[PDB]
Design a protein around this ligand. Structure first.
Ligand SMILES: N[C@@H](Cc1c[nH]c2ccccc12)C(=O)O
Length: 420
């Protein structure tokens, strides 16, 4: 077991380093950027850039294709377990390093439809987006941008000098300006929306769920360099869990502000914090998922009123982060409660499958840690089609019109930014 820490070179500091080094990689497949949106907090301290994976994992439904150089392997095993074996087999296990949250390992997309490999449910919505349910690369190196130290760190478990020379020889190519070429069109009318909304309230009325996240999807055509859309969105939104993923099948543009699950040195955290008969029950939609994997008695939640995170806990020594991800996937807070029941209703009412939206983007570092986002406020750019979805958690007392409108308000800024 190679526990050596990775070799590191520091690069000069610049307040735009991550876009500066990733600009010239954004058209390479498996080039990926996690950007903290220039946001000012502890959980928006780093930018991470990776490219040129030594190994990739592509899951499409039941199959996962593991590809490494000339070798290519297909398997129907649990894709997270398959991920875990690939990681394990690298035999690279350096000590945690708070200045290097990711020290090579896996990084990529966990799309929402990947939860069907862990949760059984009908499939009624249509698959009109062909983009993997898991698109993840194994990287033996990374570029780390640290906003608290003002440092730029290039690291590698292989020859960090040769990785540097490679990265500094990439040339800045010119890029076709980005442009929307059509108006945004919802996959549902107000009225259709109103119907699905009423259908979710029938279920709630019947006691079949307590909450369902129902979303609609906006679609437009575009031309030009998706990196360019991303620079402009990132600017405007400054979301701490943003990401730009260049996949073989399209580009994922995430302006997510929300963490999914942090696992740092076995400590788990979810979202950063920001005689009587009690009639109210307050449920954290991720509590049961975390509690199924956390160390018994380790879960802590803050005192609520009607810890730096809503849920804090401990990972058992015998589990991996990948196990933790499995158990929580897809996120309780963007599906509803009971989760799987809610997933089923969601799939009944949403004309199309969510694919990347509301899945998770993140990394499983070789040191064991993990950080992941929930991909809300995330666009999918493919074939000159770009998509952006928006949902709202419906509960018993929600109101139809207000909820419709809430869906627009969640993303109107992103859409209108791409207009004008
Ligand atoms: N914001 C995280 C890094 C990050 C940016 N975008 C992400 C997307 C997914 C996971 C992590 C990230 C941090 O400071 O550590």
């Amino acid at each position: 077991m190679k526990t050596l820490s990775p070799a590191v070179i520091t690069l000069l500091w610049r307040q735009d380093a991550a876009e500066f080094y990733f600009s010239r990689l954004s058209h390479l497949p498996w080039a990926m950027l996690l950007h903290s949106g220039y946001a000012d907090h502890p959980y928006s301290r780093f930018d991470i850039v990776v490219a040129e994976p030594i190994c990739t994992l592509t899951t499409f439904g039941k199959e996962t294709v593991v590809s490494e150089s000339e070798k290519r392997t297909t398997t129907t095993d649990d894709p997270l377990q398959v991920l875990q074996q690939v990681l394990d087999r690298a035999d690279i296990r350096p000590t945690h390093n708070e200045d290097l949250p990711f020290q090579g390992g896996a990084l990529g997309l966990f799309g929402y439809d990947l939860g069907r490999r862990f949760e059984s449910l009908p499939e009624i919505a249509e698959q009109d987006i062909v983009l993997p349910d898991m698109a993840v690369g194994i990287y033996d190196w990374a570029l780390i941008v640290d906003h608290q130290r003002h440092t730029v760190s290039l690291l590698s478990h292989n020859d960090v000098n040769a990785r540097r020379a490679w990265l500094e020889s990439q040339q800045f190519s010119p890029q076709e300006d980005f442009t929307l070429t059509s108006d945004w069109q919802s996959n549902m009318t107000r009225e259709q929306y109103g119907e699905k909304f009423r259908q979710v309230q029938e279920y709630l009325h019947s006691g079949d769920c307590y909450q369902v996240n129902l979303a609609q999807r906006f679609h437009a055509t575009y031309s030009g360099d998706e990196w360019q859309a991303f620079l402009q969105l990132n600017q405007a939104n400054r979301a701490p869990f943003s990401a730009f993923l260049r996949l073989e099948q399209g580009a994922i543009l995430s302006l997510s502000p929300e963490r999914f699950i942090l696992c740092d040195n076995s400590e788990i955290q979810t979202r950063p914090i920001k005689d009587r008969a009690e009639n109210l029950m307050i449920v954290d939609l991720m509590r049961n998922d975390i509690g199924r994997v956390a160390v018994a008695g380790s879960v802590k939640v803050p005192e609520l009123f009607v810890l730096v995170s809503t849920i804090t806990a401990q990972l058992p020594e015998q589990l991996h982060a990948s196990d933790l991800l499995r158990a929580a996937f897809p996120g309780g807070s963007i599906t509803g409660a009971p989760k799987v029941r809610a997933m089923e209703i969601i799939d009944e009412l949403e004309p199309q499958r969510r694919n990347a939206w509301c899945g998770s983007i993140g990394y499983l570092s070789f040191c064991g840690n993990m950080d992941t986002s929930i991909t809300i406020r995330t666009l999918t750019a493919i074939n000159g089609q770009i998509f952006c979805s928006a949902g709202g958690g419906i509960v018993a007392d929600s109101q139809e019109e207000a909820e419709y409108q809430e869906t627009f308000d969640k993303v109107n800024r992103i859409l209108k930014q791409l207009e004008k």
